[PDB]
Amino acid sequence: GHMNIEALTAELDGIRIEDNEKIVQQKSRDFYWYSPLLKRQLDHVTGDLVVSPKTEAELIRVLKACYRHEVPVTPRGTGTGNYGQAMPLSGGVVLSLADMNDIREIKPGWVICGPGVICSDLDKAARAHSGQELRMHPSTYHTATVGGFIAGGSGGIGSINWGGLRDFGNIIRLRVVTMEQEPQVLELTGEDLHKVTHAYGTNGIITEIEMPLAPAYDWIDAMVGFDSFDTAAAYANALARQDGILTKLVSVVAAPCPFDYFKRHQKFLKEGQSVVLVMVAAQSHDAFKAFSARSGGEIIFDATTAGDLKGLPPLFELSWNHTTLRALRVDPAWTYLQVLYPFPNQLELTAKMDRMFPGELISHLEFVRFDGDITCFGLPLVKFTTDERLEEIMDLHNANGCPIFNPHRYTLEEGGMKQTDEIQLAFKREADPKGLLNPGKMIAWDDPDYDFNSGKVWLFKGLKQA
Amino acid sequence: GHMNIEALTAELDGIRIEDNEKIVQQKSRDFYWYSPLLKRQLDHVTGDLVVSPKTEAELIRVLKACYRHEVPVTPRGTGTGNYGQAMPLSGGVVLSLADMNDIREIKPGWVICGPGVICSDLDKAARAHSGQELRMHPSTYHTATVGGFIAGGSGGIGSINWGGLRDFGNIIRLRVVTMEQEPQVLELTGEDLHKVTHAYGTNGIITEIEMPLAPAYDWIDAMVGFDSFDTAAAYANALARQDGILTKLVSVVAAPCPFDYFKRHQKFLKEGQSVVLVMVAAQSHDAFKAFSARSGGEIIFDATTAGDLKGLPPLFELSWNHTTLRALRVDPAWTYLQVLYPFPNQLELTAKMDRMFPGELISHLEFVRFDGDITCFGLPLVKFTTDERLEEIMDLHNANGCPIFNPHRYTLEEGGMKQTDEIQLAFKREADPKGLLNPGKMIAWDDPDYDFNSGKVWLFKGLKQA
Ligand SMILES: Cc1cc2nc3c(=O)[nH]c(=O)nc-3n(C[C@H](O)[C@H](O)[C@H](O)COP(=O)(O)OP(=O)(O)OC[C@H]3O[C@@H](n4cnc5c(N)ncnc54)[C@H](O)[C@@H]3O)c2cc1C
Ligand SMILES: Cc1cc2nc3c(=O)[nH]c(=O)nc-3n(C[C@H](O)[C@H](O)[C@H](O)COP(=O)(O)OP(=O)(O)OC[C@H]3O[C@@H](n4cnc5c(N)ncnc54)[C@H](O)[C@@H]3O)c2cc1C
Ligand SMILES: O=c1[nH]c(=O)c2nccnc2[nH]1
Ligand SMILES: O=c1[nH]c(=O)c2nccnc2[nH]1
Numbered sequence: 050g051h052m053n054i055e056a057l058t059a060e061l062d063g064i065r066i067e068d069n070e071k072i073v074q075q076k077s078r079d080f081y082w083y084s085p086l087l088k089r090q091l092d093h094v095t096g097d098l099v100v101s102p103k104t105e106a107e108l109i110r111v112l113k114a115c116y117r118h119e120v121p122v123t124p125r126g127t128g129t130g131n132y133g134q135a136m137p138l139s140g141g142v143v144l145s146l147a148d149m150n151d152i153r154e155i156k157p158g159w160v161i162c163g164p165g166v167i168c169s170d171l172d173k174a175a176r177a178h179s180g181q182e183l184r185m186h187p188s189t190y191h192t193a194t195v196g197g198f199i200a201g202g203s204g205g206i207g208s209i210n211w212g213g214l215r216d217f218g219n220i221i222r223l224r225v226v227t228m229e230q231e232p233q234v235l236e237l238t239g240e241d242l243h244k245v246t247h248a249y250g251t252n253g254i255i256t257e258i259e260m261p262l263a264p265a266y267d268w269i270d271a272m273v274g275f276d277s278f279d280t281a282a283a284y285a286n287a288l289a290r291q292d293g294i295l296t297k298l299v300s301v302v303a304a305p306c307p308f309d310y311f312k313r314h315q316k317f318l319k320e321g322q323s324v325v326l327v328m329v330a331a332q333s334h335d336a337f338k339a340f341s342a343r344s345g346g347e348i349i350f351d352a353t354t355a356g357d358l359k360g361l362p363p364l365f366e367l368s369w370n371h372t373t374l375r376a377l378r379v380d381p382a383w384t385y386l387q388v389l390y391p392f393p394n395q396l397e398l399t400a401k402m403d404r405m406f407p408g409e410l411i412s413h414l415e416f417v418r419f420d421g422d423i424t425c426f427g428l429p430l431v432k433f434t435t436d437e438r439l440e441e442i443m444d445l446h447n448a449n450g451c452p453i454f455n456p457h458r459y460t461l462e463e464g465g466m467k468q469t470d471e472i473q474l475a476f477k478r479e480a481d482p483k484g485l486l487n488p489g490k491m492i493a494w495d496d497p498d499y500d501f502n503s504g505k506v507w508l509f510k511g512l513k514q515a
Numbered sequence: 516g517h518m519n520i521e522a523l524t525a526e527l528d529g530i531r532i533e534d535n536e537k538i539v540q541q542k543s544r545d546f547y548w549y550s551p552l553l554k555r556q557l558d559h560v561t562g563d564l565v566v567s568p569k570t571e572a573e574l575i576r577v578l579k580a581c582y583r584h585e586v587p588v589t590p591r592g593t594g595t596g597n598y599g600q601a602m603p604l605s606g607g608v609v610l611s612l613a614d615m616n617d618i619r620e621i622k623p624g625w626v627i628c629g630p631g632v633i634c635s636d637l638d639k640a641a642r643a644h645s646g647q648e649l650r651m652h653p654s655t656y657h658t659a660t661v662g663g664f665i666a667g668g669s670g671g672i673g674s675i676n677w678g679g680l681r682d683f684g685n686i687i688r689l690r691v692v693t694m695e696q697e698p699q700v701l702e703l704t705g706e707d708l709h710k711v712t713h714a715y716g717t718n719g720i721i722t723e724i725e726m727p728l729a730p731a732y733d734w735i736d737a738m739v740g741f742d743s744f745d746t747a748a749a750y751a752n753a754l755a756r757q758d759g760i761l762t763k764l765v766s767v768v769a770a771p772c773p774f775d776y777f778k779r780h781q782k783f784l785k786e787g788q789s790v791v792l793v794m795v796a797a798q799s800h801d802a803f804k805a806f807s808a809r810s811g812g813e814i815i816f817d818a819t820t821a822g823d824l825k826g827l828p829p830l831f832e833l834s835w836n837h838t839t840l841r842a843l844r845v846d847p848a849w850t851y852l853q854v855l856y857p858f859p860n861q862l863e864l865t866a867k868m869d870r871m872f873p874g875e876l877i878s879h880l881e882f883v884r885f886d887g888d889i890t891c892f893g894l895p896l897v898k899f900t901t902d903e904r905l906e907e908i909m910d911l912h913n914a915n916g917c918p919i920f921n922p923h924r925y926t927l928e929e930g931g932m933k934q935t936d937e938i939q940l941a942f943k944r945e946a947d948p949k950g951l952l953n954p955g956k957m958i959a960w961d962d963p964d965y966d967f968n969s970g971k972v973w974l975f976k977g978l979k980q981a
Contacts, residue, residue, distance in 0.1 A: 240809065267623065290888075292886075332727040420758075
């Protein structure tokens with residue numbers, strides 16, 4: 050690489066650039082620091098400038114100039130990923146897509162928009178236009194971009210209904226611009242768009258998204274309280290299996306996390322109580338109450354009876370990695386794991402892991418559709434002591450039937466979600482022959498000897514088969 | 516010929532009534548004759564009078580008069596049931612709710628309407644009002660009433676998404692009028708409304724329904740063709756488990772049924788071909804094609820590429836018991852079974868039954884959500900020979916792990932769907948102390964020695980818990 054930052058800058062007159070060191074540093078970091086390991090390994094990473102195109106034409110200008118002057122390019126939505134995805138390991142350009150945030154079309158069942166649209170802004174527009182909203186969104190709803198969700202996220206609120214970004218149909222089309230001497234526009238549909246999902250921006254810049262839309266309902270927050278984690282998980286699993294009770298969220302958070310760390314909801318909680326977090330559609334809420342009364346589920350908070358309370362976060366901001374946010378805000382020693390508990394043994398497996406790590410781990414489940422089954426993903430909190438103990442806890446999950454997607458890594462393959470196969474490798478050669486797009490994030494690109502055919506359970510399995 | 520018809524008729528001045536023998540006979544029959552057994556057993560059944568109230572006030576005037584003259588009352592929507600549910604075993608009044616067809620409220624996620632609204636009319640109004648439609652409907656969409664669906668049906672198109680009428684949330688509220696000296700109005704919510712579902716009108720007259728609504732999408736008809744039943748069933752099972760691919764129907768119809776009996780679609784079919792009937796939402800259509808190319812599913816008919824669709828019925832009128840209709844319109848010796856193939860063994864079980872009855876049976880699956888899993892319901896065609904052999908075939912399904920809901924019976928308990936327990940018996944006494952509502956349909960009411968704690972698998976399990 051022969052980086053020439055000065056010549057790059059000269060080629061971008063009319064395009065917004067920022068080179069202030071403090072601002073570049075801030076926009077070179079995400080929420081990697083949720084992992085004590087990443088916090089140490091990536092503490093010294095920073096870019097050289099932030100470039101913020103307003104149009105696809107400006108973006109093409111930027112990529113063309115970066116290819117010519119050999120400046121690395123790391124895409125950034127709003128920098129809320131947890132693994133260092135958007136962090137520029139090699140210096141160079143932080144390519145912000147924040148100003149490519151147009152909403153172009155809203156029709157019955159689908160939307161076309163730019164990558165920088167914030168999830169809640171997209172829903173606000175889809176709701177006003179025709180009472181529609183995203184099928185799923187991360188708990189970073191109000192801050193995260195749709196583009197970064199596709200390229201760096203996996204699922205979240207709404208996965209209970211629709212599965213994950215890993216699944217056919219949850220994305221319709223991705224328009225992607227390559228890093229070639231003449232950047233190419235690709236219109237990826239069918240299976241081809243799934244080369245880009247959760248690829249950390251390593252194989253092209255998403256410049257337009259077509260995604261399905263779902264009906265916007267009056268979603269009712271409710272909490273259900275239990276005296277043990279195992280009875281909370283059994284209730285949550287049963288509720289998730291009620292096919293006529295429409296929910297958007299079914300979470301399990303073990304004591305002592307609710308009472309210790311859900312501070313604004315404390316008056317509804319008590320010491321020793323585990324909680325199930327529920328978002329239930331208004332047309333299903335009476336059925337939800339009747340089911341809960343028949344299933345041992347004491348409703349300790351219900352938005353329909355609590356009144357118009359200000360200062361209460363929505364329950365989804367207590368779920369997914371917002372559960373982690375709340376814990377580490379009070380005690381910074383908390384970190385987390387990412388776990389699958391495979392169907393049909395999720396209740397047995399979550400209980401065994403809960404009992405295996407008393408005190409040191411606090412269980413946290415999110416119920417989701419996964420390959421057509423209802424099961425749960427895990428985001429258990431872990432009290433950090435040493436690097437070695439944290440690796441050991443993950444090793445023991447893997448050895449006890451609970452696949453780990455290691456969040457204490459910053460490469461695609463080590464994170465356990467995006468599998469590298471020959472199709473993934475060939476596509477990056479096509480879309481980034483100089484290796485300028487988010488370098489360092491794909492091990493197989495830097496390692497000719499990499500056994501990318503190893504690993505067991507991949508969340509985003511590769512397209513190659515038979 | 517009930518002895519009190521003259522006196523009853525004199526009390527109904529101003530209410531529309533019909534005593535013409537031929538019309539009363541037509542309005543005393545449903546589609547029971549799909550069963551050769553019921554066709555013979557119920558041949559002599561007819562009412563004395565058809566009474567058609569326009570309003571709940573008129574209905575109450577009718578019930579109060581029938582109660583004081585002890586004339587039985589058998590409710591009727593539009594008489595499309597298959598079990599003789601709406602046929603008056605004791606003569607008396609056929610009480611048609613067809614003129615109680617108010618639609619009084621449509622909101623995001625729910626609708627309030629009268630019992631006589633035809634399903635497709637309900638959707639016509641919900642679509643015009645706010646682009647909504649029913650979650651599920653029988654394949655008799657264009658002729659069946661909503662109230663008769665609730666009291667006499669179980670699910671259908673849309674069950675792939677939502678389960679069935681057996682499930683919490685798929686009905687929100689039933690307003691019911693009792694048969695008492697002074698008829699009472701009950702507003703049944705929570706679990707209480709499930710006393711009335713599939714109870715054949717034996718424990719009160721539904722006068723208002725609140726049901727959930729779902730978004731009205733552009734549903735695309737597609738057929739997928741296979742050289743064998745097993746490969747068709749395996750594909751449909753896989754498609755049904757694609758959580759991001761939104762469908763409204765996933766049916767499997769084994770050869771020779773499609774080529775023999777799907778006449779207007781015959782130009783798309785070939786001899787020996789089994790078919791999977793699909794309704795896929797427009798926003799999932801591309802993913803459906805991509806999944807099907809990846810899953811060995813040849814799309815042989817697609818409403819978006821087929822050119823002129825004139826004269827083609829919708830694919831849902833080739834599904835559920837319309838599959839039976841198409842077959843028996845060509846050969847009247849076909850009848851059917853109703854089967855469950857319990858998860859997770861549905862592929863092995865359907866294949867085992869298919870191999871056990873060559874020629875005599877034609878397999879027909881409908882994939883549905885059932886207790887939180889994806890599995891299939893069966894409506895296999897059976898070539899009628901003798902009553903004895905039809906019983907044996909059903910016994911063999913039951914003995915091989917495939918529960919039968921016997922459609923060749925006219926009582927609630929023998930039909931295998933609506934379980935009787937103490938709560939059902941107590942409620943019938945509460946709503947119909949004289950037993951004038953559809954008499955003879957509930958064995959346990961006529962026979963206090965009848966053992967209602969038998970029967971293994973009930974589609975509509977009772978409310979009594981252990
Ligand atoms: C408290 C908290 C809770 C969270 N909860 C969830 C959750 O429930 N579910 C979930 O999936 N994630 C969750 N996350 C992670 C993160 O917030 C989301 O995945 C988010 O949607 C990422 O979007 P972003 O705009 O912040 O992307 P960034 O962090 O800016 O970038 C993410 C990745 O996408 C790439 N990228 C961004 N834009 C483009 C583009 N246009 N083209 C190509 N590549 C691009 C970046 O290079 C990077 O590799 C959470 C994070 C926090 C801190
Ligand atoms: C070709 C064909 C296909 C079919 N497909 C399906 C299918 O996919 N799914 C399905 O579930 N059914 C199916 N059916 C059965 C039937 O069409 C439906 O269940 C239908 O919705 C019944 O409504 P109806 O108005 O015809 O009721 P009716 O036949 O008039 O009556 C049904 C029952 O409900 C009672 N009843 C009616 N109205 C009231 C009321 N207001 N209050 C109390 N009791 C009342 C009657 O006494 C009777 O017991 C099919 C039938 C045919 C002929
Ligand atoms: O950066 C993240 N990417 C993800 O896919 C994710 N998924 C769940 C929770 N946090 C997450 N964080
Ligand atoms: O009269 C019917 N009642 C039902 O519940 C039903 N379910 C499926 C198919 N036909 C059916 N016919």
